[PDB]
């Protein structure tokens, strides 16, 4: 039903060589291939009409190569990644009969220096104020996420075992910890609100969970700290009655 | 050869206000053009395709139009909900090309509006033993904006909505954290113009 792609993220040491695939709608004749980075547009990769490649940019590097073998699915590989390769990698596909593209979620690559700077989340859930539950009847908890290094997370809230969505706003970005150096770690934030009677439940359970996405398992890792691999780093609350 | 220009390239709109979105384009031998959503660091959504020889398409809320000959769109958004915020996209492909040429985007943010403020700066404890607080300013009605500190050693965040759904409320907020020893929120959003009447609670 909709476009597919692997991985979702991709963390890589320059000189490294990385693939992604992309899977578009069921018999979808074209294909495209973009990247975009954060605040501009996309820019375009290449094109594929059924396994033939039929247009490419001039100016992309020939380390980027694309296939679509048996049409369907494609790959798109960049052989020794440099920096400048970082990018969300953007795939899309359309019928023959019309114009209208079809995007996948992406693929994130971050291509660094080295992976001696990269950190997995702490996170910290605050507890509601009695003063706000006495002047709103309503109760706030806030998740931060601090100290990771690059920016790849998603931060969810669970109630009870649930996903919740309603009452929930994330930061729109994650803010630097050192605003001024170019390797500097993040910090994001978050807010779940419910009524005061809610949070007054000792039963109820409140879950803030941090996905950060980090190295592999293929990767080298020689420091002491535990490798910042891609994880789950959460903290809890339980409700509070009085 | 071609260029495709969206202005402006960020709007902020308080909700149920329409709004209107510009895309231009320097060559107009095009053979459609198509507007995109985007909510950051996912993938893209079709909005609405128009062929070069069409004038008009709408899609809902959404209507566009397209003059070619000006090189010019334009996509109009009706009554703004805040599940409006997001990036438009506007893409162009060509005569005797396959490819999309994509603007830069709009940064769209519709903000919501706050029925009954009542704007306050709380402190929240951590659930897990430690030292450790952060200051919520929070229930300001959208006109207030949340300035950063003049102190590098506290963090604030900027602000954010969030939708109590089956309440029918919505409420702003904002948080202040810092690891310095004088900090506290009676001072953490000193430097940003707030309301005067903003509730400062006793001691818990």
């Known amino acids: 039903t909709g476009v597919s792609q692997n991985p979702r993220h991709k963390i890589t040491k320059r000189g490294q060589n990385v693939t992604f695939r992309c899977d578009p709608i069921?018999?979808?004749?074209?294909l495209y291939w973009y990247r975009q980075t954060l605040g501009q547009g996309p820019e375009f990769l290449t094109y594929?009409?059924?396994?033939?490649?039929?247009?490419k940019s001039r100016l992309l590097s020939d380390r980027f190569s694309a296939e679509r073998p048996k049409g369907s699915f494609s790959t798109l590989e960049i052989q020794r990644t440099e920096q400048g390769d970082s990018a969300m990698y953007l795939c899309?596909?359309?019928?023959?009969?019309?114009?209208?593209?079809?995007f996948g979620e992406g693929s994130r690559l971050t291509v660094l220096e080295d992976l001696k700077n990269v950190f997995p989340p702490e996170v910290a859930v605050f507890e509601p104020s009695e003063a706000e539950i006495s002047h709103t009847q309503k109760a706030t908890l806030v998740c931060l996420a601090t100290g990771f290094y690059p920016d790849h997370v998603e931060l969810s809230w669970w109630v009870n075992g649930k996903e919740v969505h309603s009452g929930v706003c994330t930061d729109p970005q994650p803010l630097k910890e050192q605003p001024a150096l170019n390797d500097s770690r993040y910090a994001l934030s978050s807010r779940l609100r419910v009524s005061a009677t809610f949070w007054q439940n000792p039963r109820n359970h409140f879950r803030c969970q941090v996905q950060f996405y980090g190295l592999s398992e293929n990767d080298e890792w020689t420091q002491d700290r535990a490798k910042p691999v891609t994880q789950i780093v959460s903290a809890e609350a339980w409700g509070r009655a009085d | 050869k071609q260029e495709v220009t969206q202005i402006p390239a960020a709007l902020s709109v308080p909700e149920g206000e329409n709004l209107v979105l510009n895309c231009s384009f320097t060559?107009?031998?095009?053979?459609?053009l198509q507007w995109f959503r985007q909510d950051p660091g996912k993938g893209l959504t079709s909005l609405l395709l128009?062929?070069?020889?069409?004038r008009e398409q709408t899609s809902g809320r959404l209507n566009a139009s397209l003059d070619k000959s000006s090189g010019r769109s334009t996509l109009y958004i009706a009554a703004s909900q805040p599940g409006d915020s997001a990036t438009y996209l506007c893409?162009?492909?060509?005569?005797?090309?396959?490819?999309?040429?994509f603007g830069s985007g709009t940064r769209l943010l519709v903000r919501p509006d706050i029925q009954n403020p009542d704007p306050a700066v709380y402190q929240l404890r951590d659930s897990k033993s430690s030292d450790k607080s952060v200051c919520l300013f929070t229930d300001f009605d959208s006109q207030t904006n949340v300035s950063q500190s003049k102190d590098s050693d506290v963090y604030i965040t900027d602000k954010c909505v969030l939708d109590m759904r089956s309440m029918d409320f919505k409420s702003n907020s904002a948080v202040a954290w810092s690891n310095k020893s004088d900090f506290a929120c009676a001072n953490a959003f000193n430097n940003s113009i707030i309301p005067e009447d903003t509730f400062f609670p006793s001691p818990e």
């Open positions: 594929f009409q059924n396994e033939a490649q039929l247009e």
């Open positions: 899309a596909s359309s019928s023959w009969d019309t114009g209208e593209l079809f």
């Open positions: 060559d107009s031998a095009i053979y459609n």
């Open positions: 128009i062929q070069s020889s069409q």
């Open positions: 893409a162009v492909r060509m005569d005797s090309s396959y490819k999309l040429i």
């Open positions: 069921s018999e979808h004749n074209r």
